[PDB]
């Protein structure tokens, strides 16, 4: 009521920017925490103020950070208000120009809406699809990319160009790694054909990775692709140099390449969530187990090296004893009756305690795992996969030439209002629940 | 002849599908071997064929425990079960990298087995039973 | 209401087959996606049209694919409408002939119904039990 009173007066400046640069709408974007917290009253006010002043200026203006309130809603983690801003259907014909979703084809249960891609389709400086993907501070991007235009934009970009580029890059990497293996397994006329391509592609990956590593659990792989190419170029240098330490870095680069090919399993539909499971579990669940296992290794190692060194021997120096314990946890190290040992009963007891503690510790990593899997792990995997694909799609979107992006140019120019002339995205839908005589429609003949 | 034999004893699993209780069991075999395991198997084969050429590159320095490629792959498959006795690196250029690369194979195989178990646990609760 | 108006006129041909061969009932089978999606209004109309015209012809006729609307409901993945078609108990004695489920033995809480296996029991060219099993799509 008071907001209506304040809008009724001519002295009121609706478009007034504050010290921070925010008009009223930026502020309402700033406050809108969540649905359960607030009950979505901010959305109503966002509607009412724009319907009070029919203009594009309020959405046009920018704070001192240089962001439209759409872009501000994207920069901050505000999802419930973005679902409203990004798809508005204003019924009033006088203020119908301010809508961003237009129905042009409604015949009955079947109808196709028409979204506006003005500041959304990555054709501007920083669009919504760029911000919501490349912004790490949000921690809510799962619910951001499921919105009506963005989700379909990602599918369309994948169907048009990103699938082929991804498959093609995977193919080149596969050929490269096989050439590396064919070189290292047999180690000259074939090397002239192979090693040249190998060095060129290694330098290429190293340059790209060093370029993109300065601007930054999403960056791990991209940190590893650099180290591989470093090892490769180092080994190729030490091949012409006279040394024996070239094969070491070479085969380590090999094994690292076959470990890095796990990266490209992330683009597959079904195998992607699998690799995400590998990543999340190896990052969180296993790393807790590993250090607490290493500490027992290094305790019982000095223990057994203290006992069995009485008569210099099965368990010799510390390194050999630690190795024997690691042989034991797999089943490889044959359990020797205590010989050349001061006290055999304590020797055997201490070793059996190592076995039992390792067993219960393996048991607990399995336990925490069982607890992890049920709900959080599955949702986390799906979210990470979707986000990763989105990141890849926009990474390849910026590799293309200037003319190529204009060649693709998702969307079509529709005639809306007297002359909206805006790029739009058509989405066909079917709604059986609500039956409404279609009053507001753009095209009369449904094509 | 013997391949036909083993295939017949594998095909007799088909007729367990007519039983009341044992039928859903064989359906579980089929669905899991079709979906959950086949993802694990190829991604395991690729590590096999990477670390095989790796170890065949190292341990071929003095022609030997791990000989040609086929023998090295066989030794790795002996290792994942527990059969292949871990040999201290001998007739090898650099033993520390040899041992490190092998322990990395062990750890990666372990976490990969772990993840097939994980995706499995996620699969079993509701969808797997109804599907069976 | 409009469907009742259109059935009231003598000029209306209820049994008219379209270009694809479908009468009105085949169409209603074509549209009936799911309960949550539609809320099962199609089932009501399937009932109302048959009770408006008491005949077996509409179920008898076939589209150009050579399928009765029972067989069409089986060929497509339409389950909620098939549960209705496959067990109908019409209470009206004049149109009681059009029912496919008959109760003949009711004494109290105990009763035995009696289903019709005319096009269902694999005694025909392609019965419902054949289609629903051998159809992978």
Author numbering:
A (entry chain A): 276 to 462, 480 to 508, 518 to 613, 620 to 754
B (entry chain B): 551 to 613, 620 to 688
C (entry chain B): 276 to 412
Q: Which sentences did the original study use to describe this structure?
A:
The TRPV3 channel, like other thermoTRPV channels (TRPV1, TRPV2, and TRPV427–30), is a fourfold symmetric homotetramer. Each monomer contains an amino- (N-) terminal cytosolic ankyrin repeat domain (ARD) and a domain-swapped transmembrane domain (TMD) comprising six transmembrane helices (S1−S6).
We determined the structure of full-length, human TRPV3T96A, hereafter simply referred to as TRPV3, in the closed apo state to ~3.4 Å using cryo-electron microscopy (cryo-EM). Extensive screening of various TRPV3 homologs and mutants identified human TRPV3 containing the point mutation T96A as optimal for structural studies. Characterization of both T96A and wild-type channels confirmed that the T96A mutation did not significantly alter the ligand-dependent gating profile of the TRPV3 channel. Third, we previously proposed that the presence of π-helices in the strategically important S4−S5 linker and S6 in TRPV channels likely acts as transient flexible hinge points that facilitate channel gating. In the apo structure, where the S6 helix is entirely α-helical, two pairs of interactions are present between S6 and the S4−S5 linker: one between residue N671 in S6 and the backbone carbonyl of Y575 located in the S4−S5 linker, and the other between the hydroxyl group of Y575 and the backbone amide of M672 within S6. Notably, a thorough reanalysis of the apo TRPV3 datasets yielded no evidence of structural species containing symmetries lower than C4.
